[PDB]
């Protein structure tokens, strides 16, 4: 035979060494990050990302530095598809919410539309 049959749900929460507070109180967010509107490049919209909810950052009394107690505050995971990220969240017991990929819908671009005869879409200058 040399193969067993496990029809249970895949769950590895007892093996990752993560404490209970950082499994059952965290909300993973699975999302394609939006394009920075400072820029027109789209290479950061290509993959799915899993992050977690932000916890408290407070002031260091000595220096004013951002003190944290969240170990998962810098954890950002990269996934190729939505379903891989959903499978990785379900495998680790992270309750998650998913935002759908927002691609821009295709535009209708006409350079001659800038110089029309009767339409409002003339440019007043160029």
Partner 1 sequence: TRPTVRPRNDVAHKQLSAFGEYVAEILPKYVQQVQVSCFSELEICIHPDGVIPVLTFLRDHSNAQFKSLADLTAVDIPTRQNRFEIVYNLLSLRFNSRIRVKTYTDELTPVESSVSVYKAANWYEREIWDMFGVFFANHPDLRRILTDYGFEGHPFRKDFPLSGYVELRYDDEVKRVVAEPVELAQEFRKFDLNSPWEAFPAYRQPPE
Partner 2 sequence: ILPGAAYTEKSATYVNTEGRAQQTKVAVMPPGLAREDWKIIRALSEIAGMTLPYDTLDQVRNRLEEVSPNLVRYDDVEGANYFQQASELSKLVNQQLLADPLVPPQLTIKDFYMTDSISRASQTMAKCVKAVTE
Partner 3 sequence: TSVKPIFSRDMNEAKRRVRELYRAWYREVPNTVHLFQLDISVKQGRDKVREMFKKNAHVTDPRVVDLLVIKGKMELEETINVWKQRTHVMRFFHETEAPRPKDFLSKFYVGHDP
Token pair for residue 72? 């998962």
Q: Contact residues for partner 3 (CB under 8 A)?
A: 2-8, 10-12, 14-15, 21, 25, 55-56
| Close Cβ partners of 67 (under 8 Å, ≥ 6 residues apart) | 57, 58, 59, 60
The residue with tokens 């998962």 is 72
Q: Torsion-angle region of residue 93: left (phi > 0), alpha (psi -120 to 50) or beta?
A: left
Q: Which of 18, 22, 29, 33 is in the footprint of partner 2 by CB under 8 A?
A: 29
Least distance from C-beta 75 to partner 3, angstroms?
17
Among residue numbers 19 through 48, which ones bind partner 1 (CB under 8 A)?
19, 22, 35-36, 39-46
Q: Which of 1, 5, 9, 17 is in the footprint of partner 1 by CB under 8 A?
A: 17
């Amino acid at each position: 035979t040399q193969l067993i049959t496990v029809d249970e749900k895949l769950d590895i929460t007892t093996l990752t060494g993560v404490p209970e507070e950082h499994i059952k109180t965290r909300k993973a967010r699975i999302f394609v990050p939006a394009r920075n509107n400072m820029q027109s490049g789209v290479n950061n919209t290509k993959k799915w990302k899993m992050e977690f909810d932000t916890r408290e950052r407070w002031e260091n009394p000595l220096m004013g530095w951002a003190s944290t107690a969240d170990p998962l505050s810098n954890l950002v995971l990269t996934f190729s598809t939505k379903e891989d990220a959903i499978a990785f969240a379900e495998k680790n017991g992270w309750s998650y919410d998913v935002e759908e990929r927002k691609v821009p819908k295709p535009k209708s671009k006409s350079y001659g539309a800038n110089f029309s005869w009767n339409k409002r879409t003339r440019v007043s200058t160029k």
